[PDB]
């Protein structure tokens, strides 16, 4: 009856599995040693390969290999962009459903199997959980799966169906940004508080920026921005082009290795592998064995040059964050933390650019800009692992009805409210806080005056200011004199009621 639980992140490029240890969340590695497991499935001589092993067969076996299929579940055939599947097995239409033609049977004369994108997802998930099963020594019954914000319930149900078809119990579907925040706030070092967070999920085939409002340790999502143009694949191209131009100059007369599928497939793998080294080291090698015309290619590149050739894309990321913060009706001054997530967020330069974009107050969480930062790839799986860990005791009717009714109903105050202290305005309950909540902080009598507050920006350069709104209630306690501190607590209610209590020393 009871369950084994994991957190499972499911991406177009990579997927991860993570379990819960009573103290802390642990990412599970597969039998290949990969914590970041490629979302790839391939068949050679009837044997199924997934993850890294399937990723390698994109060279000698492109047509029997399926990759970049997550954004294809529950998708109408025209809505998908088969740009990324051109290297591998191409998607095909089966009326409403998307299908792939691949030789998964051992016998040579056997016809290629036409498999639904759902069945593809089903076979991969089976292996994915199984790798966690082997590590844990126990069959895994349940998990929580991370999802993007903008995909429809058609995709969500499709994911649940394929997971059901993989005999895996999905507890809840949580969002990829919220998982990242949870992955930080649940740690002991973190201190829950009210602050506006922006999560920049830089991926392979996509990049998602999401702005949240963390109040009372609970997350409410203010704006979302998606972009399918600035991502790791673009960066991979920056390296592919850079190194391809170098190959022709050194080996005149040879075919351009981009013009041969097998040679280009080798370039893509190696360009990525060098890119990853450039995130850890200031110098990285790039090489391909018998790239084209039977010629080995060998070269190097230092980080500074890479940042130069990749400058164009990096600035694209900056405009994503600025657009998202703008989409929330905010300024970079309003941002407290930026949680860097996704595989491309290991790039050191991206963090450096974000530091310049934001004030010195704003926290930038990446291994290169904060001693407390976490591995950007692991965040979502940790988030999923934690969420899965907490839910495992509850039942499915509890999760389903609590999801829609309780999450929608709560309204949020549009203005901050605080006590005014002139001889200025101090916030007590930050704006956009969900009701109901409670907050309190610390030569004559003390006079507490509760007012509404908003944030404005004044060009004089710019800085955050508070304009005082309407007064709610006024209060004075008469005999404390010289004492230094004043504790004031105030409780907002579901009926928009405001309750101040006085007993400050």
């Amino acid at each position: 009856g009871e369950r084994v639980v994991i957190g499972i992140t499911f991406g177009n490029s990579n997927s991860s599995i993570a379990h819960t240890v009573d103290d802390k969340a642990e990412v599970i590695a597969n039998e290949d040693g990969d914590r970041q497991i490629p979302t790839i499935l391939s068949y050679v001589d009837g044997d199924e390969y997934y993850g890294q092993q399937a990723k390698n067969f994109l060279v000698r076996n492109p047509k029997n290999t399926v990759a970049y299929f997550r954004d294809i579940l529950g998708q109408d055939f025209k809505s998908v962009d088969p740009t990324h599947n051109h290297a591998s097995a191409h998607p095909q239409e089966a009326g409403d459903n998307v299908v792939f033609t691949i030789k998964d049977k051992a016998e040579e004369d056997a016809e290629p199997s036409t498999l639904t994108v759902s069945e593809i997802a089903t076979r991969y998930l089976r292996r994915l959980v199984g790798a966690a099963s082997e590590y844990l020594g126990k069959k895994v019954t349940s998990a929580v799966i991370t999802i993007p914000t903008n995909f429809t319930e058609k995709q969500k149900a499709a994911l649940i169906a394929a997971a059901a078809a993989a005999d895996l119990e999905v507890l809840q579907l949580i969002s990829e940004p919220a998982a990242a925040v949870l992955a930080y706030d649940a740690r002991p070092e973190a201190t829950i508080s009210d602050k506006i967070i922006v999560v920049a999920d830089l991926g392979g085939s996509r990049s998602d920026v999401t702005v949240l409002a963390s109040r009372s340790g609970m997350y409410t999502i203010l704006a979302t921005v998606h972009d399918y143009e600035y991502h790791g694949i673009a960066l991979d191209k920056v390296l592919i082009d850079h190194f391809s131009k170098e190959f022709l100059k050194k080996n005149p007369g040879a075919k351009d290795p981009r013009e041969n599928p097998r040679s280009l497939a080798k370039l893509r793998l190696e360009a990525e592998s060098t890119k990853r080294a450039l995130s850890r080291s200031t110098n990285a090698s790039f090489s391909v064995e018998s790239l084209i015309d039977g010629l080995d290619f060998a070269s190097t590149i230092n980080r500074l040059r890479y940042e130069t050739i990749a400058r164009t894309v990096f600035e694209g990321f900056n405009r994503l964050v600025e657009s998202a913060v703008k989409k929330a009706g905010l300024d970079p001054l309003d941002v407290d933390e930026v949680i860097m997530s996704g595989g491309t967020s290991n790039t050191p330069r991206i963090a450096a650019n974000f530091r310049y974009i934001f004030p010195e107050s704003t926290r930038i969480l990446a291994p290169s800009t904060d001693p407390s930062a976490l591995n950007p790839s692991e965040l979502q799986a940790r988030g999923a692992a934690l969420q899965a860990s907490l839910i495992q005791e509850f039942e499915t009717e509890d999760i389903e009805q609590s999801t829609h009714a309780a999450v929608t109903t709560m309204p949020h105050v549009t203005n901050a409210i605080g006590v005014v202290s002139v001889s200025k305005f101090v916030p007590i309950i930050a704006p956009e806080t969900a009701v109901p909540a409670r907050r309190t902080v610390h030569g004559g009598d003390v006079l507490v005056k509760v007012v509404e507050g908003s944030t404005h920006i004044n060009v004089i350069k710019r800085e955050k200011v508070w304009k005082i709104g309407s007064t709610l209630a006024e209060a004075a306690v008469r005999g404390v004199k010289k004492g230094a501190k004043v504790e004031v607590t105030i409780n907002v209610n579901t009926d928009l009621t405001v309750i101040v209590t006085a007993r400050e020393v």
């Binding site: 949580i174 925040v181 949240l212 997350y219 409410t220 988030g383 509890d398 999450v407 549009t414 405001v498």
Partner: protein
């Protein structure tokens, strides 16, 4: 003690939606099911 009851401006709160993750939501979800 001195305690006053004030009313927020009717337009001070707009309807928004939350993220059903984390212990603080799940702990608050208990209060909503009860009422």
């Amino acid at each position: 003690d001195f305690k006053a009851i004030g009313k927020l401006t009717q337009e001070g709160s707009s309807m928004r939606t939350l993220e059903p993750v984390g212990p603080h939501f799940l702990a608050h979800a208990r209060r909503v099911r009860h009422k």
